[PDB]
Amino acid sequence: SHRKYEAPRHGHLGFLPRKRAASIRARVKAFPKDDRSKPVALTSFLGYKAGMTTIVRDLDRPGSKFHKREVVEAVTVVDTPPVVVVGVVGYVETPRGLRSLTTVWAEHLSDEVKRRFYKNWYKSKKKAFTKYSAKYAQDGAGIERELARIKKYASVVRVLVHTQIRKTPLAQKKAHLAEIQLNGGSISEKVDWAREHFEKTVAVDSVFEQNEMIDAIAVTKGHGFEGVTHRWGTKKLPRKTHRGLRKVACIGAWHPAHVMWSVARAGQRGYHSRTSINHKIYRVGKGDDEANGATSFDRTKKTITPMGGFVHYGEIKNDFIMVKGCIPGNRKRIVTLRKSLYTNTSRKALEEVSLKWIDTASKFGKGRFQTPAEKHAFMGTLKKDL
Amino acid sequence: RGITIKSTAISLYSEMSDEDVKEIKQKTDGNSFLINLIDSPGHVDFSSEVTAALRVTDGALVVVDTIEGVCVQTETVLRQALGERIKPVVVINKVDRALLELQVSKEDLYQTFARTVESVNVIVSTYADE
Amino acid sequence: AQGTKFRISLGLPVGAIMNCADNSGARNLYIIAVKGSGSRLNRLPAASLGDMVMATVKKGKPELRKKVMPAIVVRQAKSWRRRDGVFLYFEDNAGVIANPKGEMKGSAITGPVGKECADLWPRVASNSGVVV
Amino acid sequence: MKVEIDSFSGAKIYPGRGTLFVRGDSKIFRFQNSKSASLFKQRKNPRRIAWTVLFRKHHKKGI
RNA sequence: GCAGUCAAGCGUUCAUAGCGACAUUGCUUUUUGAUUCUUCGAUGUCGGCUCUUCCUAUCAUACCGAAGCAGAAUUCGGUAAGCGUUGGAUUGUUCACCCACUAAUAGGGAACGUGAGCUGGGUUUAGACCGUCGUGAGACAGGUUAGUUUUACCCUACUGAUGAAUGUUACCGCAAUAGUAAUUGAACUUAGUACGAGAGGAACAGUUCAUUCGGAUAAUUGGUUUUUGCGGCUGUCUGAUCAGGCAUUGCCGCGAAGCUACCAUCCGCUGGAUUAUGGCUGAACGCCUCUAAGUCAGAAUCCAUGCUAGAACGCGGUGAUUUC
RNA sequence: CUCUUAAGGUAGCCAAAUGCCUCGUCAUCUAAUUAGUGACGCGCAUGAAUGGAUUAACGAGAUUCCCACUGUCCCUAUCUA
RNA sequence: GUGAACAGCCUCUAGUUGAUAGAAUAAUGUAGAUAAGGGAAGUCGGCAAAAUAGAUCCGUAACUUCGGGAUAAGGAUUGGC
RNA sequence: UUCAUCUAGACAGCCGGACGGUGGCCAUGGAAGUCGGAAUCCGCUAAGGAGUGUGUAACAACUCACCGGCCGAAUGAACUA
Numbered sequence A: 001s002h003r004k005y006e007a008p009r010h011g012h013l014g015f016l017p018r019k020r021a022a023s024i025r026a027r028v029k030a031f032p033k034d035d036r037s038k039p040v041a042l043t044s045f046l047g048y049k050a051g052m053t054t055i056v057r058d059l060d061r062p063g064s065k066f067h068k069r070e071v072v073e074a075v076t077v078v079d080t081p082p083v084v085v086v087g088v089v090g091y092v093e094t095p096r097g098l099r100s101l102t103t104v105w106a107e108h109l110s111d112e113v114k115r116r117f118y119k120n121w122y123k124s125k126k127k128a129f130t131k132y133s134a135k136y137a138q139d140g141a142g143i144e145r146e147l148a149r150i151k152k153y154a155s156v157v158r159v160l161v162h163t164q165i166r167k168t169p170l171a172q173k174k175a176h177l178a179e180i181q182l183n184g185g186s187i188s189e190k191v192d193w194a195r196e197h198f199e200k201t202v203a204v205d206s207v208f209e210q211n212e213m214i215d216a217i218a219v220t221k222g223h224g225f226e227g228v229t230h231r232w233g234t235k236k237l238p239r240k241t242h243r244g245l246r247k248v249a250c251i252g253a254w255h256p257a258h259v260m261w262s263v264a265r266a267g268q269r270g271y272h273s274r275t276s277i278n279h280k281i282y283r284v285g286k287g288d289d290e291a292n293g294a295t296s297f298d299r300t301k302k303t304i305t306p307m308g309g310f311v312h313y314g315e316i317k318n319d320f321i322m323v324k325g326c327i328p329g330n331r332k333r334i335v336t337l338r339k340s341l342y343t344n345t346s347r348k349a350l351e352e353v354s355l356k357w358i359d360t361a362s363k364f365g366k367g368r369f370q371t372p373a374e375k376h377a378f379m380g381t382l383k384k385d386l
Numbered sequence B: 001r002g003i004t005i006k007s008t009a010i011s012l013y014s015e016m017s018d019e020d021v022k023e024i025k026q027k028t029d030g031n032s033f034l035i036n037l038i039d040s041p042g043h044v045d046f047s048s049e050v051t052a053a054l055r056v057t058d059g060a061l062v063v064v065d066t067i068e069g070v071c072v073q074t075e076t077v078l079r080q081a082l083g084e085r086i087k088p089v090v091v092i093n094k095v096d097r098a099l100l101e102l103q104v105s106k107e108d109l110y111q112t113f114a115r116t117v118e119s120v121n122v123i124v125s126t127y128a129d130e
Numbered sequence C: 001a002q003g004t005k006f007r008i009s010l011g012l013p014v015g016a017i018m019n020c021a022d023n024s025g026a027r028n029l030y031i032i033a034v035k036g037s038g039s040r041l042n043r044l045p046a047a048s049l050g051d052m053v054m055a056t057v058k059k060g061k062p063e064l065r066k067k068v069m070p071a072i073v074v075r076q077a078k079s080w081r082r083r084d085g086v087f088l089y090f091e092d093n094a095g096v097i098a099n100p101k102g103e104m105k106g107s108a109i110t111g112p113v114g115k116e117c118a119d120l121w122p123r124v125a126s127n128s129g130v131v132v
Numbered sequence D: 001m002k003v004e005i006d007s008f009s010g011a012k013i014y015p016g017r018g019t020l021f022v023r024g025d026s027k028i029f030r031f032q033n034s035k036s037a038s039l040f041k042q043r044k045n046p047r048r049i050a051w052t053v054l055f056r057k058h059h060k061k062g063i
Numbered sequence E: 001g002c003a004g005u006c007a008a009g010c011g012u013u014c015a016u017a018g019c020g021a022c023a024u025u026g027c028u029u030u031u032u033g034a035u036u037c038u039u040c041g042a043u044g045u046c047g048g049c050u051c052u053u054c055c056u057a058u059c060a061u062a063c064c065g066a067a068g069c070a071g072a073a074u075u076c077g078g079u080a081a082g083c084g085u086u087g088g089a090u091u092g093u094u095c096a097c098c099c100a101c102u103a104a105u106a107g108g109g110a111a112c113g114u115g116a117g118c119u120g121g122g123u124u125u126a127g128a129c130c131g132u133c134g135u136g137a138g139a140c141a142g143g144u145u146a147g148u149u150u151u152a153c154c155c156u157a158c159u160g161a162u163g164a165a166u167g168u169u170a171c172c173g174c175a176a177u178a179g180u181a182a183u184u185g186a187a188c189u190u191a192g193u194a195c196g197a198g199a200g201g202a203a204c205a206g207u208u209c210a211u212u213c214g215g216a217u218a219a220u221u222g223g224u225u226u227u228u229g230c231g232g233c234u235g236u237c238u239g240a241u242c243a244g245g246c247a248u249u250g251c252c253g254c255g256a257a258g259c260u261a262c263c264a265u266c267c268g269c270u271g272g273a274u275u276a277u278g279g280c281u282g283a284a285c286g287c288c289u290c291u292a293a294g295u296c297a298g299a300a301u302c303c304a305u306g307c308u309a310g311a312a313c314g315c316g317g318u319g320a321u322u323u324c
Numbered sequence F: 001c002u003c004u005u006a007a008g009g010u011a012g013c014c015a016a017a018u019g020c021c022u023c024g025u026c027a028u029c030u031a032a033u034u035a036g037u038g039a040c041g042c043g044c045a046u047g048a049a050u051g052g053a054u055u056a057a058c059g060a061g062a063u064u065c066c067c068a069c070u071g072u073c074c075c076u077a078u079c080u081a
Numbered sequence G: 001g002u003g004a005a006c007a008g009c010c011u012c013u014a015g016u017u018g019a020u021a022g023a024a025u026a027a028u029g030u031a032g033a034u035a036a037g038g039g040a041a042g043u044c045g046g047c048a049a050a051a052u053a054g055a056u057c058c059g060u061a062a063c064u065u066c067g068g069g070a071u072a073a074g075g076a077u078u079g080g081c
Numbered sequence H: 001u002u003c004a005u006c007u008a009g010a011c012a013g014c015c016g017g018a019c020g021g022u023g024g025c026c027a028u029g030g031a032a033g034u035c036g037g038a039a040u041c042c043g044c045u046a047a048g049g050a051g052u053g054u055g056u057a058a059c060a061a062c063u064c065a066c067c068g069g070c071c072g073a074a075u076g077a078a079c080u081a
């Protein structure tokens, strides 16, 4: 029979299967369209998600009811120590799609990167790339043939960067290595730029700037095996039903005599590659700068990191991106940050933003004090001492 | 609602410069004049408040929206005046409409005014007391 | 509806009774519908402060009972979060009987009124005491 | 961006943090956290609650 | 139940704007009959609940064509099922009816979808009351009240989860194929303007919000508390004190972390080809004609862009590959 | 006055757990009532120990409403064994 | 012991410490809990749950077979010293 | 398939004319070819209905049959399957 009352379907089917991502680094699938009339530059950037905090700022949005009035907004903080180029990869157009033609690497590589190639680093004989490096022997005999090979061919050039994991508070030691597409100009200045950067780091003011709308590509917080009530948003069933409420009642009609792909089932929730778009950059922080949490209106030297330190993360000692709102993934997870794939002119974009103030109260509790200074200035002296 | 419904009266006291009263081509004392005014309604449904005001007055100030021209009710309130033997004078009003809405040009405007006056005198000659 | 109104948490679904804050003669207001609400299977429509509801008077002068009228919610009693970061709430829910144009069948509102509700409704502002 | 002070504890209230309550009398109350708010609604007396600003003043502590 | 054909007539005037008699040709299988082919060593009956998908004879939303289309509003039709189609009072109801919001509250199918999915209000056992019937036992497609809703561990399907083999191992990627997504409204302003005698009274562009849906996220606010974390309280037991036990987590206040809420916050891309329809050039047919050749535009459509998985028998690049 | 059968439904009661028509009609209660209550009564097919009408108290009986209450619901989340 | 009490809760005498174990802490369950604002809108129906609860003092309606209805309703108070 | 027109100039297109008794008779509040009935004659003609439409309150004003100018070879109507 027909339905009885119409209601929208539960859950979006262009986000299927709801399985676990192949890896915890979400694949950055599309890069932006290359404009070759602009300097060789990176298009994405790796990151580590630290935590969130709160800001206030004036609002320039004429005709709103909060024009020139302060607003307060959540923000996520990505710890972005500069990343070090160690490779160049070049892809050719072919009638079956882009083909990687060759890879060429830097002459030496941090052991924190070479860790990426082992599952038992400690007990290895760490011989990875020992004999590749010898092609640099006299003048780079072999390697300069490859670089020419990329220049001759190669509709697209990608650079292999890797995170300086050791510069963060994680227990990891094993860096994250990723391709980043050079949107430079001329497939040649693109690959010169790569050679001119082997083992040379790239900071992130090079890549992004204040107010730049950017996308976040990461792997959703995993949650294990979920019932359909919470996993799909299904209606919890009436208190009286025998055999369970967190269920779908009619797994399907008699015909098609098959449970169909479109019906909510119990299974894995979270741990899904998500590409989430249009998060405005609110501040690009310098580690080689004091007073990261400072602002032209607050002006009381303090770092970004909050009292007690970011919960489950640690302290911010490096460059960081502070982006408006929230992003897929949890604290400590690798986070690719893409430049926007289109030129947004919404004017919600395009809006210059200036932080009045950046909360740095503790997140481990009902944090009352911005700085250990102002605690004391408020509390007084105490018995243990001072 | 922004529509006059009852026609209501007000008496205005106003002066005139010494050279202005010299032109007055009828016997005329002093320099201060007393204007007994009535603000009338346009709607046909209220025409009874026009004849009620035209019985108590001597001249009539007739207003014509410049862009709308002389309209059907302009025509019939005039037949109300000339029946009662009342002298008219005209204000072609609302011109800022012509510069903004119509982007009019000086000749475009003058000739607007001419045919409008031509239109009123047609009404005036047909019904004005021979 | 003289203005645009930013979203605020809903706290008065249908069936809710709120005090009638005006000297109209009504002691309360029983919400049966909320103007501007949309549709979802099984979802009770609900009002926040400033919203125009359709109500009846369960306690009050007979001349106002047995009859559906529009009301405007002026306090809300359910924590809501302004764009300046504050979660606030009143001690009670309350509204005033109005007419669709937004005018007020009352004559003077008693008790505080919320900022959002009074920006929306001038005729309501004209009779409000302490706002926000 | 005036910070405000907790009505019950005199604690400092940074933007976004805590709650604000409009009593019937139009008297505004600010609470920096949930605990301060809970106590006040239990009708507790801050002068008798040991950690509040206005209990150290009534006991001339730390001044 | 729905749709054509002829056109007397309605439409002041005028057959076909919108309608349409007398006739007559059809379609549909959510109606009810007619049959009795399957099932009586048994295919779980009504309705709701839940949830998915499909149909179009389209209620709304996109773009259009017609009008007895001035505006506003409405009607008729076209492409069109992309997307939505609701909250309640009485009833077991399907149906009905009314209140009320709404852009709209369209009709249907899937064993009159869906009972090892629920419920069990109705129907339809045995208990019992009434009314009419009956000599009686009893009967009623009359009323009424009580009345056990069983199994999955197997196969397949669906959801998620591993995995042999390919010389070994590790890293970075490609993209076949499959999936795909956003929705709709209001206020300001345009404007008391176009139009209109008046009464009334728009639209495109711009601004601010909002609804339904989606994916995440936890700074905040809120909820949860075995942090049995700190405090408080009763009873009893440890001779008192200190400090504890027991009271199935003894109870109360607060309670961080975690989990989480339109109860919380953030985010949801833009190129092309088309439909209908409007056109250009232009014959057929010395004219005309959007069409016959050729061609411009153009829709909530489709294809891509983007997003999701990645063929476990599709692929590339790359590293290191066992002294004894 | 009369016919069929002997009599011809009185006192009461009612769309009642008894009314087909029927969601009866009127009043009331609700924004809205096929529900409830009060009325009406040519009552398909009420009615006097096949007992009629009424009744305080009692009732794990059927039914309607109100106050309090609340995860029944909006609309779900969370903790324990 | 508490307490009106052979209630419940803790203890002395006496008896028992027996129910296959270990490690994990997904979904769905069964059993036990809590919940912002709203408060039956959920449902055939308030089913289930919640609210109430002892005792002292106060106050207590229609109706009634005068016996009741009654803990009606409804207020106040409660430790320690 | 049947019937028509055409080098004595058709069909099409364009272009000129489309008159005079006459506002023809009965009506009509008005009706001058053009709401409607009845009449359907004549004159002057290359031809022009007592009117094919549009129009008016009624005339006016355009329009068409009909005639002609132009061009120069074929073309028109009604049926069948």
Ligand SMILES: [Mg+2]
Binding pocket: A002, A003, A004, A006
């Ligand atoms: Mg439907």
Ligand SMILES: [Mg+2]
Binding pocket: A240, A241, A242
């Ligand atoms: Mg059950």
Ligand SMILES: [Mg+2]
Binding pocket: A363, A364, A365
């Ligand atoms: Mg925290």
Ligand SMILES: [Mg+2]
Binding pocket: none
């Ligand atoms: Mg105008």
Ligand SMILES: [Mg+2]
Binding pocket: C041, C042
């Ligand atoms: Mg429902």
Ligand SMILES: [Mg+2]
Binding pocket: D034
């Ligand atoms: Mg909390």
Ligand SMILES: [Mg+2]
Binding pocket: E001, E002, E028
């Ligand atoms: Mg049908």
Ligand SMILES: [Mg+2]
Binding pocket: E014
């Ligand atoms: Mg016609």
Ligand SMILES: [Mg+2]
Binding pocket: none
């Ligand atoms: Mg028709």
Ligand SMILES: [Mg+2]
Binding pocket: E036
């Ligand atoms: Mg059969």
Ligand SMILES: [Mg+2]
Binding pocket: E036, E037
């Ligand atoms: Mg048979």
Ligand SMILES: [Mg+2]
Binding pocket: E043
């Ligand atoms: Mg079966």
Ligand SMILES: [Mg+2]
Binding pocket: none
């Ligand atoms: Mg169609």
Ligand SMILES: [Mg+2]
Binding pocket: none
């Ligand atoms: Mg149209």
Ligand SMILES: [Mg+2]
Binding pocket: E068
């Ligand atoms: Mg017409």
Ligand SMILES: [Mg+2]
Binding pocket: none
């Ligand atoms: Mg669909």
